[PDB]
Amino acid sequence: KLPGDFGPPRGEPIHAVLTSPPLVPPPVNRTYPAKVIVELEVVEKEMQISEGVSYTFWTFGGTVPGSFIRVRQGDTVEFHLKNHPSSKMPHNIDLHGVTGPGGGAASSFTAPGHESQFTFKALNEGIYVYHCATAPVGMHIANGMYGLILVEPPEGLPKVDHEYYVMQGDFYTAGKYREKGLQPFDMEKAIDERPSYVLFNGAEGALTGDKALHAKVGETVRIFVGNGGPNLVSSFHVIGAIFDQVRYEGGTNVQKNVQTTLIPAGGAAVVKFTARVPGSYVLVDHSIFRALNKGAMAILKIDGAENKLVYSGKELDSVYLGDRAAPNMSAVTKATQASVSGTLTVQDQVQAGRALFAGTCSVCHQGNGAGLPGVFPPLAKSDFLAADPKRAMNIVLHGLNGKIKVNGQEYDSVMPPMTQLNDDEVANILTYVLNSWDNPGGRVSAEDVKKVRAQ
Amino acid sequence: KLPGDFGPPRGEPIHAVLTSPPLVPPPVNRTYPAKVIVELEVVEKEMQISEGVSYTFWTFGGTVPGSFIRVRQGDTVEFHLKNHPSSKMPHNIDLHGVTGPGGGAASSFTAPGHESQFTFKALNEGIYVYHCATAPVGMHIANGMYGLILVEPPEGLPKVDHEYYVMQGDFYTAGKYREKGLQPFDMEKAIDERPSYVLFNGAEGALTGDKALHAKVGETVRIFVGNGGPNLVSSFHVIGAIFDQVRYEGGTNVQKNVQTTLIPAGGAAVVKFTARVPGSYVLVDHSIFRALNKGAMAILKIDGAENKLVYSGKELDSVYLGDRAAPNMSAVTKATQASVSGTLTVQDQVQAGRALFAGTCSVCHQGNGAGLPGVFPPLAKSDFLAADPKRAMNIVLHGLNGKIKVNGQEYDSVMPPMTQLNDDEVANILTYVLNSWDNPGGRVSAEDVKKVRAQ
Amino acid sequence: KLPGDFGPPRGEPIHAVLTSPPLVPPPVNRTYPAKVIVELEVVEKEMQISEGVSYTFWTFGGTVPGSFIRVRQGDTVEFHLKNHPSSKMPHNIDLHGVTGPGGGAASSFTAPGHESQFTFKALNEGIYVYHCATAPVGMHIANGMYGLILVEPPEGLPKVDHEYYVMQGDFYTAGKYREKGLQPFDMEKAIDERPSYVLFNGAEGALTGDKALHAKVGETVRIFVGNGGPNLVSSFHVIGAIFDQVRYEGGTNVQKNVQTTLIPAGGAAVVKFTARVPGSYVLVDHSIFRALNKGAMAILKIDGAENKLVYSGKELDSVYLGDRAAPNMSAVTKATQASVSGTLTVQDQVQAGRALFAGTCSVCHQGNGAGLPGVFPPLAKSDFLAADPKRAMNIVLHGLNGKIKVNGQEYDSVMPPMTQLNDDEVANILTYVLNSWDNPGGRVSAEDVKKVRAQ
């Protein structure tokens, strides 16, 4: 006998309601198998992968990850794939959990402006990745063509207060991390498995700040977690909390009470969290340069009463979360746009630099530029800064060590280099500093920084 | 008490029958512990890692992976390692599952033309990797020195219809992927964990096309899956199906009903599959550039009746499987040989290009070169192609965008670059196209392409 | 109800006794929850990451990994973090297993010369990584800022004969592997996840030779195994043995009878081993270039009677363990120091070369330089060596093939290149050989080798 042997579809055909990340459709809440009609449209379009950094994404339903599909084990699914007329490429779909060659791929080839359909029975309960399967497949996946399909057990999943949808992917731009402009896909970096960005839900900051996930003390949260890849394996982890349960795909095994899991490329898991104390809980790939240098962090923000018996301490800040502590970094987007338009003002630079200074500089120099006397020199009203702005560009790019005198006090420490900052970032940060804290004003341009970097 | 405490060996000494991949020895079918004599011979030899690409493999038993060994928990194994006189290197063996230092390594050092032996008790049921343990060990492993040993539980494994043997490895050539000739091992790429090929069973296409694994609807298939490494972890996955069971090494835990697993470097697992519907099921490393750009795909082809209640769709084709949809790519081997011999004909190039066109070009241009009107321009009877063959070389290497006119119709789309194709591949593909579909004939040489690439 | 609900702290406040790797504090042996005061001091200091290779480590408690902390589920922990006045950087802590934002990070920011404190309840039994959480976090972790905290179940762990503490990390030096001197951290290699060293307990040889872990036949050994990362996932494996049990973090799942596991970056596990037969058992990352080319090997040496019914063979030697078979390689440290001081003698070079020859050359040429007649040519009393020392430098760096005559006999084989050896290593090895086995003496300098490498 096949699994999912619940008899022929009954009732009326159901038109599936799909959701955009990070939301999930309601529980199916049904005791009979149905014919479920799923309609999903591929759209190719430019979106911001980071502030001021555009990328041509290929999407299922206009989002990365693609629209979430929710059905019941034993359902017959009539799957309709449309390819928007604006597309340049053909596309198709492989749904994990489908019983049949290619997971649908050979019956879903869809040229721009066309539609395809195929039917399958959902024999297999579980959470499953779906993705494009059009050669070169890795390119399609790298461009954002992946999402999740949930096939519920017949009795449904246990009730929880919130359900969310989070999916990791690795991305490959020609430019370096945070280099502005429209960035092409880079096949060389992709083949080498050397991503420039590693993200949740298709962009830096997609689930941070004002886009965080929410719940309250005492509530339960289920997260459907995918890893679209194409290539990386996630050391998936929640900072400051624990997973009550982790279940992969439709596996019989359920791990309980773990904080760090491994999610294969192409894999998916359901995790459960119980909110205990208020604050920001960070979902990361704990291959930690991905999380804190390439974009792979997402926030579940918990509202409610502190419990000093459990945790006496404070909410996170920029020391850990960096420039993603703040609600957003829209000033960076704005300054980048103004540069393109040729209208970049001092204040545009100042506000972009303010956003970028958080974490990146404030960890040592403080949010108010005061430093710490004799340990971290001040940027506020800094004689040393004012004396030589070009030296300050060199200090950001190349670091500084040795004895110096700042505002009458000696420092004898080490500031690490920061050459990974792009020329616009250095320029905007230094313009912010120059225009703060009784510093002399003026500006540093990206071209100024380019020249210092080349010397 | 030690595990495997089934008493002294009884009956007669048994000379183990080893098998070459992808086959497995018969179940031991025995109720008593035995002395089992295993004889394995190391052979160093050139073989084709891909069509027209030779590599000096170091092998246990003449194959990659090496010969499969099958014993029973509680057996006493007298292990004989011979090193063929033609060898240049010394070799030895570490069998996982052996209780003792190095898994046998210090008692199996075997110079060319010599033999070694050691005895161990198989205390540990499970599936286990064995490999060479001769410094530099990673070099030996990278050259193909790994295989599997099964230590059965005393009652035997449950009966299945088929048992197969599949083992992943990462490979490191001086040349790039599909660059022809005898390719040296590349220690720099190996240390960096940057393989040029990632393969099942020692070659591209080892388990595809006419070398696929077979079964029928309703049958059960057990696959002994190794990962020899040296360095990669497999996101091991079956496209279009599910694993009924996954069990690692001799672990007590058995996962059921998963599609994607993680197999450590040096690890092994037993998976079980039940054939439900006909077609090609693809075993892959779902770090998907490995599977679809570096060689890591294998096929289990299922014969039998369609079941439209389960899956309404079609068998896979080149869109997903690429140039491995076809039975083989022997024409590539032949053309490469003819180049070396200085006898390369137009028809040699045409047939090699035909093989390579599948997937790589046909996904957009179609198998018959017709394209799709106003979306994908034709290669069949293409005025644009005929007008400028050197432009066509540039288009393959560097891509094309912008408005063009082909056979009277305007196109305004994007063909991605394909610089990863080697000069011979570009040459042979374009010669195929030129000699098909009422195109003007002639040929493109590898040297022609080399010149365009250098400009 | 929260987990760990064992009531308010009782008894007296307990000042935790922390241990340095590879030792563990005693079992808590307590039936009531307590207030436990933990004091941990950050120290930045130069230490040898390899012989003659210095590195500026940032440490919790003066070691890498940091001091081991051991508490009981249900305890209230008052955590005190001090930052030594000699520090240049601020530091903080995130303990996995803490319930609260950042695992403590926002309440533990500690400038040089300062102290911080926070209190948390240990709700979660298990083994957990702790690490610094100061931007740039990956830099802090890469510099050595990680360790383990055990939160015992209320009844305690089962009694074992030995408990040890082992933690993997990936390291990123500007220089290549074994390049001498004080090596800076390399942010470029870190972002790319391309470590120069992969180590247990902060140094090459930290747990090999005279620093091996010990036990006796019949005894049980528990190892608390961390993976600090920052970036790599360990294919953690024991050569020649099996793990009775593997349990991750505080998971409910326990795997039994496996040899190879996967430990996520930031993850931790408890493994159990039962000693069966004498000899050296090697803990490795089985992404095997890490273990055998980058430093990731540790030894558990078992004393006691051989059991020929289980294993007839020998203890490991340099063929497998290489230059870590010997008790230590202190001669390398000494020679490097003498080079810096300008006092390097012939004998300093000889003893350093002796240490390095083991495995790296002896696998083919033998420990006594005799080779094997007509298969591996001799280095002992070698006419070919004596005839041209510069040719011998070229042979080490670039390999040798083709027919040669050595001491009257023809060889027609292949010696692989060894360009990864540094100039001092080549120099010291060849000086050893020249001063052994009736060879002519003299010396090769690092500058001699530099010149040959550049030609």
Ligand code: HEC
């Ligand atoms: C801690 C790790 C630091 C971070 C992050 C940044 N800076 Fe820094 N900076 C640091 C130190 C210890 C020193 C003194 C070095 C010494 O030789 O003793 C400095 C110095 C500067 C200066 C010059 C002195 C002054 O005006 O106070 C400048 C202009 C400066 N730092 C700027 C700066 C900016 C803009 C940063 C973010 C991009 C930044 N620093 C980060 C320590 C640390």
Ligand code: HEC
């Ligand atoms: C879809 C992703 C494509 C694949 C794969 C290949 N080609 Fe292509 N090709 C594609 C498009 C959209 C276009 C037109 C671009 C535009 O500016 O509108 C082309 C064009 C060509 C041409 C020139 C026009 C013609 O003769 O039809 C040639 C000669 C060509 N393509 C060849 C070709 C070959 C040999 C391929 C496999 C190596 C190949 N293309 C792949 C789209 C796609």
Ligand code: HEC
């Ligand atoms: C086995 C894989 C080898 C290792 C490791 C090393 N050497 Fe070697 N060496 C090897 C062979 C097969 C040959 C002969 C090559 C041929 O063309 O037939 C050699 C040769 C040399 C020589 C020259 C001949 C002689 O004097 O015997 C030298 C000086 C030499 N090898 C040195 C040497 C050193 C110092 C090594 C460690 C750094 C080393 N070899 C490793 C095989 C192998």
Ligand SMILES: [Cu+2]
């Ligand atoms: Cu697509």
Ligand SMILES: [Cu+2]
């Ligand atoms: Cu897939």
Ligand SMILES: [Cu+2]
């Ligand atoms: Cu070998």
Ligand SMILES: [Cu+2]
């Ligand atoms: Cu091994």
Ligand SMILES: [Cu+2]
């Ligand atoms: Cu720190």
Ligand SMILES: [Cu+2]
């Ligand atoms: Cu952490």
